[PDB]
Swiss-Prot record:
This is Heme oxygenase 1. The chain holds residues 10 to 223 of 288 of the full protein. Signal peptide: none annotated. Its EC number is 1.14.14.18. Keywords: Apoptosis, Endoplasmic reticulum, Heme, Host-virus interaction, Iron, Membrane, Metal-binding, Oxidoreductase, Phosphoprotein, Transmembrane, Transmembrane helix. The lineage of its organism: Eukaryota, Metazoa, Chordata, Craniata, Vertebrata. The transmembrane domain is necessary for its oligomerization. (Microbial infection) Interacts with SARS-CoV-2 ORF3A protein; the interaction promotes ORF3A-induced autophagy but is unlikely to be involved in ORF3A-mediated induction of reticulophagy. Homodimer and higher order homooligomer. Oligomerization is crucial for its stability and function in the endoplasmic reticulum. Interacts with FLVCR2; this interaction is potentiated in the presence of heme. One of its GO terms (biological process) is cellular response to cisplatin. The gene is HMOX1. Expressed at higher levels in renal cancer tissue than in normal tissue (at protein level).
Length: 214
């Protein structure tokens, strides 16, 4: 369509369903998520956001990204650090896994941020708008299945404290995305990069599912 935000949503409808159908995600949705499985998901998110946010900081003043730069409202690294200290303990940095599928995702994020910055918006869209939009449903399931202790920690990732209304922010973020100026060639590569982002998540899900079935 005309608006990039609408173009992205329509172009990734197929791959989003592919993600919903992923065996690992099917189990999650059926409420069949285990503590070991959830831990792997949180570790994955930590590596992904560390890379994404490092690249966002590198390109925050570039015209290809500045319009969608919302550090305070969206940053997730600190929240994940808090969560991993709960899930993996005080020495989480020394024990969290960093698997090949996690590395493939991180590698692409760095390649984009360092050599193809104009495509970073595709990854910011896929991750941020995705976790913002589906965070409520994804969290509700986890907490009711994890039966975790009332220790007030472990799920900070699912709350964006600097966004008072997800509805208002998503409209603003979409408006900013649509304000970005890019050639038709770039626009097509951004759309493709968004699909690539979903595929990287899907391959990660497949790897995690394999690691858990031994
Ligand atoms: C367990 C599987 C998943 C569930 C159940 C889920 C759920 C949701 C929900 C409820 C929405 C809101 C749709 C609407 O009402 O307009 C959504 C949007 C979205 N999701 Fe997911 N999601 C899943 C996996 C993923 C994955 C793996 C990604 C990518 C990392 C992702 C990226 C997105 C994006 C980018 C949107 C924004 C759509 C837009 O442009 O409006 N989701 N998701």
């Amino acid at each position: 369509p005309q608006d990039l935000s609408e173009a992205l949503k329509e172009a990734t409808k197929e791959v989003h369903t592919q993600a919903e159908n992923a065996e690992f995600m099917r189990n999650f949705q059926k409420g069949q998520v285990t503590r070991d499985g959830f831990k792997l998901v949180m570790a994955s998110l930590y590596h992904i956001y560390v890379a994404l946010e490092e690249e966002i900081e590198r390109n925050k003043e570039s015209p290809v990204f500045a319009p969608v730069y919302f550090p305070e409202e969206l940053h997730r690294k600190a929240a994940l650090e808090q969560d991993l200290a709960f899930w993996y303990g005080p020495r989480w940095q020394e024990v969290i896994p960093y698997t090949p599928a996690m590395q493939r995702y991180v590698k692409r994020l760095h390649e984009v941020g360092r050599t193809e910055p104009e495509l970073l918006v595709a990854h910011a869209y896929t991750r941020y708008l995705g976790d913002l939009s589906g965070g409520q449903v994804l969290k509700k399931i986890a907490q009711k299945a994890l039966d975790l202790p009332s220790s007030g920690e472990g799920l900070a990732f699912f709350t964006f404290p600097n966004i008072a209304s997800a509805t208002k922010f998503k409209q603003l973020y979409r408006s900013r995305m649509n304000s970005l100026e890019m050639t038709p060639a770039v626009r097509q590569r951004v759309i493709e990069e968004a699909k690539t982002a979903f595929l990287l998540n899907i391959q990660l899900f497949e790897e995690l599912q394999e690691l858990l079935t031994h």
